Amino acid sequence: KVQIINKKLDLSNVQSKCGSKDNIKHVLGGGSVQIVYKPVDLSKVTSKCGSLGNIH
Amino acid sequence: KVQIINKKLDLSNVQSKCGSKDNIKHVLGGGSVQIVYKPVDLSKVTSKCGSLGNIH
Amino acid sequence: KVQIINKKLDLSNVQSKCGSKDNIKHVLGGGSVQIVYKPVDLSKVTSKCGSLGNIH
Q1: Which of A2, A11, B25, B54 is most buried, by CB atoms within 10 Å?
Q2: How many whole angstroms separate alpha carbon A22 and alpha carbon B21?
Q3: Residue B22 to residue A27, Cβ atoms within 8 A
Q4: Cβ-count burial of B11 within 10 angstroms (0-12 exposed, 13-18 middle, 19+ buried)?
Q5: What does the alpha-carbon distance between residue B56 and residue C18 come to, in Å, rounded to a whole number?
Q6: C4 pairs with which residues across the strands?
Q7: Which of chain C's residues have a Cβ under 8 Å away from the Cβ of A29?
Q8: C-alpha–C-alpha distance, residues A21 and A52, integer Å
Q9: In chain B, which residues have their Cβ closer than 8 Å to the Cβ of A18?
């Protein structure tokens, strides 16, 4: 048995000039909030040159 | 048995000049909020040159 | 047995000049909110040149 009372709460976003990259920004749960954040990442930024040559 | 009462809550977005990339921004759940965030990523940015040559 | 009462809630978007890329922006659930966010990504940005040559 649980009994919760959420009265007069404030979760308010006000922005003027803002660039963002935000995943889970504003979340409100009545009785519970579970968050599982497991991002995998296998990325590559490669550059391959064979026999480069620079001459003045 | 659960008993919840969500009265007078505020989740309000107000923006003026804002660029964003936001996945899960404003979420409100009556009794529970589960979030599973598991993005996979296998990306490539490659560049391959064989026998580059620069001469003045 | 569950008993929830969501009275006078506020989830309001007000924007003036805003560019965005937002996936799950404003979501309200009566009793529960489940979110499974599992985007896969196998992208390529490649460039291949064989025997480049620059001469002044």
Answers
A1: B25
A2: 7
A3: no
A4: buried
A5: 49
A6: B4
A7: 33
A8: 39
A9: 15, 18, 20
